[PDB]
Design a protein around this ligand. Structure first.
Ligand code: HEM
Ligand code: HEM
Ligand code: HEM
Ligand code: HEM
Lengths: 146, 141, 141, 146
């Protein structure tokens, strides 16, 4: 987590404009569609057979919102991600058995989502700040694996 | 393997790029340089400053090649043979870097084609870039 | 793409493995579990303790499939269709993991076939595990 | 490092039995042969047209000894690899233009060479500790890239 002050202000200024409900749904939905293998964790979500079935599934939308919810909180503790995410890291490992690579795929999808939404506003340099951020969060979420 | 669906998706999304491919190619590079600085080790000879003509020049070359793979979507291995040879034998770019560029290309397109950058298209474009990368890396060993 | 030399190298090396492939399968898993603990996420239902019969049994299973791959080195895609299916539609292991097991497999062969693990044979087996990895993840999307 | 005293001792004790001269030459040469593209940095070394020509090339062997040398000294500062490889990290970035991914390829090759050499002695638990060190070293070396 080598976020320069200016990188941190940039992350924070943009995060100001995000509708976490919405972004959360899009990011998770898109994950399940671009990397269908990730659907292994959601057999109880119902119908994920097509893009529309995934993007529109009430269960995917609700889960996305939850996930981005936790991510937003992470954004307020950029100084202590490991701490912030420790009980969640344990849960994903010990109970959910989620391969941490999943956390990196979601980060990339999220970055594409932000690009999608902010257009020209998601400048090369803002992307680089967000790249450091999703990597920091994925690392924090994997810190307790064993 | 790309499905008919995928093919339609790619031709469509790339269709929209049109005349901006060059600029989008340049932008994908800059994004890459900024987010994954290790990729810079391959361009020690370039001016990587913002608005570098070398980068502009290079973005166009990359975009032309992608445009060429789209035009030959059913025969990419052959359409890209020469480039596959160049990369394996001269440039010798480590394979992991292809995924980094692919990623920055998807961000660029996302940033410019909001109406077309749908979930389905995103998936198609991702499989496409993966396939291009595979071709370009096929003769490495 | 496996060259004829490669196919020879592989068949030779695997030839020496013989009645121990099962044990080497088991040892490779154990090394993978300890070195890359994230791989354990795919085996919650197993007893991953040293010398577990679940691990041993699975070790054999993997070993056997490799054998079958060496034997059909010319027609891998076809020899492993079912396995490619299982992995893409049921197991859904993330592709990064194949590289981890492949590596633990080299280490295991190296440690057991000193004479045979020459630099040229190392290169071949690597390519081979790589090809096997590609085949197994080819129907992922 | 996130090495356990036990993990530290395993590393340390195997290393004591290592001939850096021989292991250094073999690790680097295997690298040039398994991952042919790493040869882009050693054009001046000569004929690397064949396994035999690589493994026999003295420039390769001598570069290999220099590399394991520096590696070897790094094992004495296992609790600050960052500070031990700072100058080497800048050098690699700014002068050599070596993509850090190469550091990881080498690491894995190193482990294969140790297994090759020590057979029985190179147990799963010992490999695990070594994997942590090679990853650690690669990270330290890549630390100053910008
Ligand atoms: C930014 C990364 C992520 C964050 C912050 C996050 C956060 C959360 C939270 C807050 C919960 C609910 C906790 C609870 O049930 O007590 C959860 C559950 C879950 N997460 Fe994660 N998650 C992340 C990534 C992922 C990814 C990428 C996957 C799978 C690809 C995943 C799989 C799951 C599953 C399967 C559940 C349980 C859902 C249920 O059945 O109730 N998570 N996550
Ligand atoms: C799908 C992805 C890629 C495509 C389509 C592509 C295509 C090309 C093309 C068309 C050229 C110019 C060849 C000529 O001179 O005619 C080129 C050169 C080059 N590429 Fe690739 N490339 C890709 C990935 C990469 C990556 C990921 C890197 C490294 C990060 C890379 C590094 C280089 C370098 C260093 C050159 C030489 C440029 C110069 O010296 O002018 N390429 N590539
Ligand atoms: C070298 C590539 C691989 C080969 C040849 C291979 C082969 C096999 C075989 C033969 C089976 C048993 C099928 C059956 O039960 O009929 C299997 C199952 C399985 N494989 Fe793959 N595998 C490979 C890579 C991986 C990797 C890297 C992982 C995860 C890290 C993995 C995870 C699994 C799991 C979880 C099962 C099912 C275990 C069970 O419930 O018994 N495989 N694989
Ligand atoms: C274990 C990781 C590595 C360590 C500790 C390491 C260390 C060193 C050291 C101590 C030098 C001496 C140069 C000087 O002081 O002027 C050197 C030079 C060099 N290294 Fe690295 N190195 C590592 C990995 C690599 C890899 C993987 C490559 C490329 C495959 C590489 C490419 C080079 C080159 C090209 C030189 C310059 C030699 C010359 O001047 O001819 N290094 N390295």
């Amino acid at each position: 987590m080598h976020l320069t002050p200016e990188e941190k202000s940039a992350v924070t200024a943009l995060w100001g404009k995000v509708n976490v409900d919405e972004v959360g749904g899009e990011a998770l939905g898109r994950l399940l569609v671009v990397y269908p293998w990730t659907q292994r964790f959601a057999e109880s979500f119902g119908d994920l057979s097509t893009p529309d079935a995934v993007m529109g599934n009430p269960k995917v939308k609700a889960h996305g919102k939850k996930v981005l919810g936790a991510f937003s909180d992470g954004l307020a503790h950029l100084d202590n991600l490991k701490g912030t995410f420790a009980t969640l890291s344990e849960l994903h490992c010990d109970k959910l058995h989620v391969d941490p690579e999943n956390f990196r795929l979601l980060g990339n999808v999220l970055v594409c989502v932000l690009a999608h939404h902010f257009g020209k506003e998601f400048t090369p340099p803002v992307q680089a700040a967000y790249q450091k951020v999703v990597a920091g969060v994925a690392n924090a979420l994997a810190h307790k694996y064993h | 393997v790309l499905s008919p669906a995928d093919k339609t998706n790619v031709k469509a999304a790339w269709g929209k790029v049109g005349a901006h491919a060059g600029e989008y190619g340049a932008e994908a590079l800059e994004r890459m340089f900024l987010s994954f600085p290790t990729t810079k080790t391959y361009f020690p000879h370039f001016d990587l400053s913002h608005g570098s003509a070398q980068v502009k020049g290079h973005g166009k070359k990359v975009a032309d090649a992608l445009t060429n793979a789209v035009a030959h979507v059913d025969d990419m291995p052959n359409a890209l043979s020469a480039l596959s040879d160049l990369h394996a034998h001269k440039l010798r770019v480590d394979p992991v870097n292809f995924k980094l560029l692919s990623h920055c290309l998807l961000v660029t397109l996302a940033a410019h084609l909001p109406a077309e950058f749908t979930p389905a298209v995103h998936a198609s474009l991702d499989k496409f870039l993966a396939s291009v990368s595979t071709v370009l890396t096929s003769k490495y060993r």
